[PDB]
Design a protein around this ligand. Sequence first.
Ligand SMILES: CNc1ncnc2c1ncn2[C@@H]1O[C@H](/C=C/CNC(=O)c2cc(-c3ccc(F)cc3)cc(O)c2O)[C@H](F)[C@H]1O
Ligand SMILES: [Cl-]
Ligand SMILES: [Cl-]
Ligand SMILES: [Cl-]
Ligand SMILES: [Mg+2]
Length: 213
Amino acid sequence: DTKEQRILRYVQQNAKPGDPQSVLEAIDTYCTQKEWAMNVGDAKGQIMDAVIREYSPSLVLELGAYCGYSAVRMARLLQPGARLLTMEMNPDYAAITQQMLNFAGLQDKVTILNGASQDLIPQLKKKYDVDTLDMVFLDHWKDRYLPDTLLLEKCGLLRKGTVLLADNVIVPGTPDFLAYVRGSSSFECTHYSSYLEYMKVVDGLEKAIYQGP
Ligand SMILES: CNc1ncnc2c1ncn2[C@@H]1O[C@H](/C=C/CNC(=O)c2cc(-c3ccc(F)cc3)cc(O)c2O)[C@H](F)[C@H]1O
Ligand SMILES: [Cl-]
Ligand SMILES: [Cl-]
Ligand SMILES: [Cl-]
Ligand SMILES: [Mg+2]
């Protein structure tokens, strides 16, 4: 099987069904003791948690679910009624993510969309009845952070105060995105230095708050 399949099994057998914390802990243990994987991890995850709690978003979009670790992290902190949409183009990973969220008991708060962001973003308003997003978590292919930020704006999905939170702005890095938001009067940016998941390597999150056109 695959590393991602190996990870979901561990959670099912080492976490409490319906207990998101036990799920996060099982994934962190597996990835530290057995096989590394590109989950956001606990170090950056704690920063994400602090951001989510601060802004209290009603509707969050995640680009790139992978195995559902960040989706579990965020969804567990959403207020009743608030929702997460997560886009994952790899059908195998989308299915792992859905099962991870089911196991955690978070399925009513999350919609996992199996498709590519560039195809799904233009459908959010008409098909998924979205007005604007309160927060966007970017964690998909690094060269797509900037194209998708520009597409979100084109599609009218950002409002004054929409929070963009971007993983991996140091490693692997997203140089065009980072230069763009830091240079744009339409974003107010903050850098949160941290560490690459499961590694003693510096990484960071960038928060970029949209200011309008
Ligand atoms: C392009 N549109 C997409 N739409 C929907 N789902 C997508 C889309 N594009 C990808 N996906 C989906 O988003 C995910 C991909 C995430 C990519 N992430 C990384 O590469 C990444 C890499 C490292 C890393 C660091 C050090 C090192 F030595 C090796 C690797 C660390 C990280 O935290 C990462 O996030 C998923 F796999 C893919 O199907
Ligand atoms: Cl993740
Ligand atoms: Cl609810
Ligand atoms: Cl970590
Ligand atoms: Mg990442």
